[PDB]
Amino acid sequence: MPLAFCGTENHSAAYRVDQGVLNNGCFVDALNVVPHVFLLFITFPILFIGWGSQSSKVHIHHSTWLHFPGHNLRWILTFILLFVLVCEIAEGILSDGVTESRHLHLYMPAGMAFMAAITSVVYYHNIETSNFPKLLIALLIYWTLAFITKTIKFVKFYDHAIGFSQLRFCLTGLLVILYGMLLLVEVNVIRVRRYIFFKTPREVKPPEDLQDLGVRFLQPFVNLLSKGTYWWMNAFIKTAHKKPIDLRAIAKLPIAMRALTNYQRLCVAFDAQARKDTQSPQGARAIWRALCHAFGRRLILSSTFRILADLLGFAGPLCIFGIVDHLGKENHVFQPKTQFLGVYFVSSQEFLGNAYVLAVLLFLALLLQRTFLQASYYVAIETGINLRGAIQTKIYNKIMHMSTSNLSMGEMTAGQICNLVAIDTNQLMWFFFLCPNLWTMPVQIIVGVILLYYILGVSALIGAAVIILLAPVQYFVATKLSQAQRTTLEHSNERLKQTNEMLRGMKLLKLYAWESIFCSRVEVTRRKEMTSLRAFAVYTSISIFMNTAIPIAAVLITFVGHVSFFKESDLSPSVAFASLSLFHILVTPLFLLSSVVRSTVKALVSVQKLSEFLSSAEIRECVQIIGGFFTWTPDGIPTLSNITIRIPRGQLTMIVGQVGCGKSSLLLATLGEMQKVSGAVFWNSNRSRGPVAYASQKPWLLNATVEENITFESPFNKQRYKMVIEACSLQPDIDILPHGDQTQIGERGINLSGGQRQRISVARALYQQTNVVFLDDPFSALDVHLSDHLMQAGILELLRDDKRTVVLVTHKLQYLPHADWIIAMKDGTIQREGTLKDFQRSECQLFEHWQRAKIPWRACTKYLSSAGILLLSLLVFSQLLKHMVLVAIDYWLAKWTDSALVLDQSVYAMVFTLLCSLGIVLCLVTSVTVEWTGLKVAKRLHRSLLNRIILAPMRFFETTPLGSILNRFSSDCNTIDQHIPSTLECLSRSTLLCVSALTVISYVTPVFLVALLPLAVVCYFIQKYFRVASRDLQQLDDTTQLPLVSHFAETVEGLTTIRAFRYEARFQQKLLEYTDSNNIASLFLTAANRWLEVCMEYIGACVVLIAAATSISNSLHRELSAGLVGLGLTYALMVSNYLNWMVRNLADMEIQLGAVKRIHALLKTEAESYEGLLAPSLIPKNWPDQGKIQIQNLSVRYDSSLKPVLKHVNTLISPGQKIGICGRTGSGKSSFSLAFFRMVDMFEGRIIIDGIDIAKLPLHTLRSRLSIILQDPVLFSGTIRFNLDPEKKCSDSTLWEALEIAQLKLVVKALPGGLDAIITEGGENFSQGQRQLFCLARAFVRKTSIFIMDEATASIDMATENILQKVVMTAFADRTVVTIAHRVHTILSADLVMVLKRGAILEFDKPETLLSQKDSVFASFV
Amino acid sequence: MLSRKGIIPEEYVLTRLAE
Ligand SMILES: COc1ccc(Cl)cc1C(=O)NCCc1ccc(S(=O)(=O)NC(=O)NC2CCCCC2)cc1
């Protein structure tokens, strides 16, 4: 009885070749073996020679691809003929398993056809990579050969009169037209590329996007299986573990996603609509129609994949119902009825009612659901990202035409348009991510409600009414959540600005011993934010609570209704577990549908925002102006008219005019940026415009290097840059910043001063090599007179050797009647534009003669010092107890259904209610404990970060910038307050559900764990490589969308400078490079996420296959009783999207715990301990009023490394002798001024204080009674009485003495509040003398005898005189001073003085006149 | 149990400053 091919019954009577050769029903299957082994045995030498040549030379293996025409339908026909060949294997096994013999002619041809079709697509792939089309002649003669043999078999089935009743007739007719239809695909290749029989072949090249050198993101040009399963990602993602992902390692990007290309497509759509339609604006509906018209051809494709993914989703619970129903009722028949020609044909009802066949059908349904779902995700993502590209370029195109009016720009500042780019366009992008959901998620829910009613009955409609009343509850909780988050975040903005004003003036607040009191003024605002954050935690626990206790209450209400209330159709375990798995596939879209509805409302609001922006007023469509009309409102009232002035080439026009008489309007009207109503503009550079150089009254600099704001995207030569840096006095300006030509100048970088920024803008105007140069008052704020004179003489000299026009419009009348062709604007009109002698004839000259490590160190430190074990134990215990209860509620359903099908039943229902009650109660406990632990976490970490940043030396603030401390304060507190606890609840639910699910799978099938261990290893490595790639692409996402919104700020601010140069096109390309570097980082983050999700979900599909096969096998024989088996299969389906969530939430927890690692690292910088090593009240007096601090040889250092400065200075301040001691400003001025206050490391010597020990004094009390003034003053915002004395807050009459008799009386008494008004962020237009007024106020009120002074940086001469008069009052009232003043030409008035240059005792003059008589002290005074 | 699959977009007025 050996392995016969045909039947071994009737003594080999099925081999009788009589009655025809083909009418023997086994010989036709013998024919079908022939073409498949023909292809294998003609394409094994081809494939192995090909595979060897890649093992010799594989460098060019990622170079150039060309798919043959008809490629996508080739692959989908191979997949669906693979599907039906698996079905004929299933039919063949189930038909031949009814007789005594083996009957191998039912599943030898189908099995070898399966391997032949797989090898016929590997051969096609190895011939599509290498353009050699004449070698797939073998494959087309295969398909015509295989089509003929199944044509033989099908027409003999019609002649043996099977008909469509038996199953293999239907399948064979289906796969006859399969091989026929892709044979027709093969002759399409013959027809198009014309290689076989045609005299001239058409030869195509690989496309230009592939042939470019660096393109890594090769997803739009790869075969269909690699688009489905992201196989190309592997060579990228495995590379990411050796070398990190630099921005050169990411792609350039393909042509289909370049920001210019999507912008072209979107502009074609807008132009086509506005021509054919009668819409006068391109308003809201116009933009809305245009986006759909340009991107519907992809968005419909994403929705198509999503609908197919939804239907193949419901072939999961349907397969559980079929499996468990057949696994009940004894497995009685297991044999086919039909017997045609002695062979048994399986009836199709017996086919799709079998156990293993329906299980393999379940497996193949999941490998198509969970691949079309991922293709649906990515196509929705990729079309959304191409909206980000085209809409940012569209917004920026209408930045390049926006007028700087008082109505267009006078309404919306650059903060509005930066928030427009960021918030608005991202939520419009998020609408096109969620766009297939509003087309499919209703079909998902509707087909879900319908077939859940067919499975169970009307009690399932009570259950479906519960979950369909869990979408509005999620919506209203999310609405209250967004309200609370709105109020909390715009409250903590005020807290972060207050912390910025308390951490910028670190030296000034530490000098008056005011780090503790200002920390309290921060802590009060923090606790108001903490109340708002507690409301955030309440409204986000209920989202967790509803997500994890609406389905349990739904299941409890469902089955208790069906048995107690209904008594209609008793379980039937198949009915119960099909209903459970349907509830999980319904619970996922429901909570997310609330977020979809939110995104739809925001999308409509967002296109409204972007429509009123896009259709606001534009600007418009040598020098000569005739008509003289120029306005800002686009009709009526010209703000500068009667302008009839001509300034041709070869000129340097100094201009003049009144204060606010239309000066900048006149210059900008020549610039063509004003809507000139009446008049013409003749224009010719030595009517179209040349690159007019310009520098506005308000300065402007790109947030870049100082040379980058000087050369301004132009070539760089050393000679002209050195001359412009010398003439504009820029070498002291470069040295004024600690890096010069590498420091990030301007805003977002090194904080400059007003004179410095005005001089930098003038430098960019001269260097840019232009046929005109406009200087709109450069010498207005720059009070350095000789700088302006050298600039004036140097501007004339530079342009005279260049022969190009200049125009300087200001009131600097020192040169205006001398050597210009001047023009004067009186009352907003032109009087005379001529020579200086004409102004000597119109009465106007009178005025000029008048690692890659991770969590567990940082996560342990986070959980310990933040939570506290009295709640850490409650959190971990409640999660584990809730999940044992969830295993119990599922297992109790299984045990009750087994004992109900084979028939204490009300006992089962009652204990089911008392297990569902524990489910809801434990989920509320876990939902409260996670968010409450996170709330307490943020409280103690914020007080620790504030106190350790307070209890720090000022030397640390010299080392690290204010940018680093403010960033890891504000943004990282946000991450550890509102993002880590929600991620913690999601992570502690996701990994615990996975351990729960695999314990249950291993419990039902103890064969699984042997097949789990290699599967868990593969799951572990996929997890490992994804973390390495996802972290690096995440930082590459963040640090690339930052410079782009930086660009949108820096463009809208200095708009008129860019349109002046006609250098708009270079900034257009800078955006497009930034947008390409953003979209390629965003697309790699998307495609790496999909590679994880496809690969981990296939691992989940293999879980389903192994679990279902071993469970049914152990329930046919070992009698599992099928209650457990349904409980097995309904968790095998849920594994596939718990491994996904475990790995993704672990990656998000990684990046977010990295923002608590940095806060602990910055808590690790502690110094300046308040060490009073005596009896701390006996060492000082009540207040030191001697002023007799004899400094004794106090030698200074900071790091104590290589160079002390102060040496042997045995110098005393006598009581009364207000010793103004100036020295060398290069070495010993600023260092000594800081170290005088015990704010530096005096490593030796003796620093006395009135003869007492100032090394063991209370440093709070020591820094209390010794006042100071500063060089660059700043006012901490608050009350004016808080600006005078926050630690005291003594009385108003002390403030009356202060704010009258010191200074500023006609500002304080003329203020609206007085001493109790809010200092509006520093006193933005108060004075510079308020610094000295606050100095004298704090010197008389805080018992301050000493007053250590520094010089004014920028002040008025009368303000310096008023400071001198207040200094006379300071000696008369405080009697102790030791002053150093960098304004050296005025610092001679003292009693005794010492000039101590380069760290020595070099000059001493106890009378003041002896310094001016001697040699060395006079030379520093000459 | 999905938060990143939810609407990740939130309000961002203050940004990362420097360093
Ligand atoms: C996985 O979600 C769902 C689960 C169930 C349902 Cl019924 C709908 C969705 C859903 O929301 N479908 C929208 C499409 C979607 C949304 C989020 C995600 S993702 O997993 O967050 N991957 C990323 O976001 N990549 C980002 C994209 C933005 C720039 C940076 C990279 C992936 C795809």
Ligand SMILES: Nc1ncnc2c1ncn2[C@@H]1O[C@H](COP(=O)(O)OP(=O)(O)OP(=O)(O)O)[C@@H](O)[C@H]1O
């Ligand atoms: N770009 C503009 N946006 C809004 N209003 C403007 C603009 N330019 C001019 N104006 C209006 O035109 C009038 C004349 O301004 P003018 O050109 O005299 O300023 P300016 O004198 O150059 O400035 P400054 O006096 O500071 O040098 C002003 O009252 C101003 O309100």
